[PDB]
């Protein structure tokens, strides 16, 4: 039922406003240990010999690396994505230039996506960056992805209940609730807001009085947009293991300036980045995936805030490998 004291608390607004984090140490420790499994950087290698564009036969992304540099990458990729499966997950034992296994082609696009993240989305990932490990955590299927309908459990490494299974219709409300921090909000924030750029998150008017011409009847946004934004915010908070005051002074959710923390701006960039990733890198990959990876509408698994963050306000508590693997970005 309850969590024993003490609680760790932080301050994120002026004194007296009750803004800041409330954290259970046990829970933080369990997440710290889970995230400390991040494999350490492989030892640096001397840049020696010709570029692998001249040495190997089918190297389209990593072509400016030397042989030892490139094989160091391939070791790191195997550690991050398929340590249990090994190099043969993506490769033919007898022909390392064969694209015959689908993980090869996907991994190539993932290489491009990852460098895109570290080069074009520094407004969100800063100097910390991502690697394949950030999402994959040592398995080819990342533990936290989303379909065009809610699935349970959130961690696909756990085995679903009959009711949790997406085909059991009697369990839909619970599948939806657990994605919105157990609220009864009747909206799926992922397909509404993170799958594409079609919907506006902001719903609150920016004037005191209602403007004539947007304020009556069918000119009005339905109230459901406000439910939906709230649902997105429940989901976002739960995905970072935090509460609203991490980003907002609830005195005025819609105001910036002194009424928002810098984390709110970073979160804003995060919404745009996730949209780019899903629309332009992850959703097109239903062409290249087996039918057992796709959802009930032939969609590929896509990313939300939890995919990288897994319940922590900084993924892997700020761990970085950017300086150790320049080939993953940023790219000049």
């Amino acid at each position: 039922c309850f969590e024993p004291p003490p609680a760790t608390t932080t301050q994120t607004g002026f004194r007296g406003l009750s803004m800041g984090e409330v954290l259970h140490p046990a829970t933080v420790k369990a997440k710290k240990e889970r995230d400390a499994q991040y494999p350490p950087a492989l030892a640096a290698v001397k840049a020696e010999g010709p570029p692998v564009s001249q040495v190997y036969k089918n190297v389209k992304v990593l072509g400016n690396l030397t042989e030892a540099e490139f094989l160091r990458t391939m070791t790191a990729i195997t550690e991050w994505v398929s340590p249990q499966e090994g190099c043969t997950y993506c490769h033919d034992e007898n022909n390392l230039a064969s694209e015959a296994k689908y993980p090869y082609v996907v991994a190539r696009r993932m290489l491009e996506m990852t460098r895109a993240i570290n080069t074009n989305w520094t407004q969100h990932v800063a100097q910390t960056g991502v690697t394949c490990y950030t999402c994959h955590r040592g398995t080819p299927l990342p533990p936290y992805v989303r379909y065009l309908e809610p699935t349970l459990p959130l961690n696909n490494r756990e085995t679903p209940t009959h009711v949790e299974r997406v085909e059991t219709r009697s369990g839909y409300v619970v599948r939806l609730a657990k994605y919105t921090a157990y609220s009864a909000l009747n909206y799926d924030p992922f397909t509404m807001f993170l799958a594409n750029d079609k919907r506006q998150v902001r719903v609150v008017p920016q004037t005191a009085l209602p403007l004539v011409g947007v304020s009556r009847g069918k000119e009005r946004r339905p109230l459901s947009d406000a439910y939906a934004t709230f649902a997105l915010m429940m989901s976002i908070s739960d995905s970072l293991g935090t509460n609203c005051t991490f980003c907002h002074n609830a005195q005025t959710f819609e105001s910036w300036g002194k009424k928002s923390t810098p984390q709110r701006a970073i979160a804003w960039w995060g919404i745009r980045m996730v949209r780019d990733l899903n629309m332009n890198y992850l959703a097109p990959l239903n062409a290249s995936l087996p039918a057992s990876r796709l959802g009930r509408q032939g969609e590929a698994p896509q990313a939300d805030c939890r995919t990288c963050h897994q319940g922590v306000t900084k993924p892997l508590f700020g761990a970085s490998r950017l300086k150790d693997y320049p080939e993953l970005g940023p790219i000049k």
Partner: protein, 323 residues
Amino acid sequence: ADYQTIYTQIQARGPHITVSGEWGDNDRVGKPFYSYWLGKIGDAQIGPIYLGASGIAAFAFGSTAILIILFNMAAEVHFDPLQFFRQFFWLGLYPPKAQYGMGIPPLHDGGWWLMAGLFMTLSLGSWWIRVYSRARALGLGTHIAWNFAAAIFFVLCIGCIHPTLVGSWSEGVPFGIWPHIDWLTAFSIRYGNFYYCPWHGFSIGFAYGCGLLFAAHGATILAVARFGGDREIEQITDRGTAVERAALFWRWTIGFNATIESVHRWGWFFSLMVMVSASVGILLTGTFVDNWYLWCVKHGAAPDYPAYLPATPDPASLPGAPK
């Protein structure tokens, strides 16, 4: 200590009294029975109950509304009885999610909600008639009915008057445990934080005052139960030492006092004002104010605070930012 104020030490039994009303004396059904444990903290007699036309009409319409809600709820769990009990709190009947304006919504998107709203409203009106006419039948003033009227009026405000004034049924209160709760935040978020709505403030002021008054009034009467202060009607018409001491306790404490009758006017007025203030607030919201916080800023009332972590510009307004 006066143990009588905690519970009845020695209970009494006697023949059941029936005060005759101008009509309906035969529509009292049931046989009275007595509960000894109830009788410790209250009156031991349960029943009979009057059973007029308006009361049955209320039960009729109410059950219809309940049934429409429960059926839609069960549809939400594909009629699995076990998941229905599990998920009961999270199940609901929703007004339209899409913007149809004031057009009648499809049954699958708000029509059933509108239906359940109609029958609940009829049930409330029917019960109101019961509350009113029962008073006149027994030769009593209609004070309760006018308080109850304000409470019904507030429900109509959040249920359909405010939707029709802004012109969208999408703004009604859903039916269900958690979902009617969720509406409060969706609404407050839409209209710019309800803490900054002065009529929220008024309503809360009166609601808190109802707690203050009933704690204070209840405590006062119990403190003068030894002189019979609970027999309030005859203390109104013939002031006894009970109400003299009650009046002097307050006068010597706060500097002024009520009478045994006027304290009930105070209480009645405070109760009424919870609902009247709430209704003015909803009637103004959406029709004439869009963001209550900005409205308080416009009129120079909102507090401001220093930044703690750095002030943060809206990134969407920086040059070259994506949409």
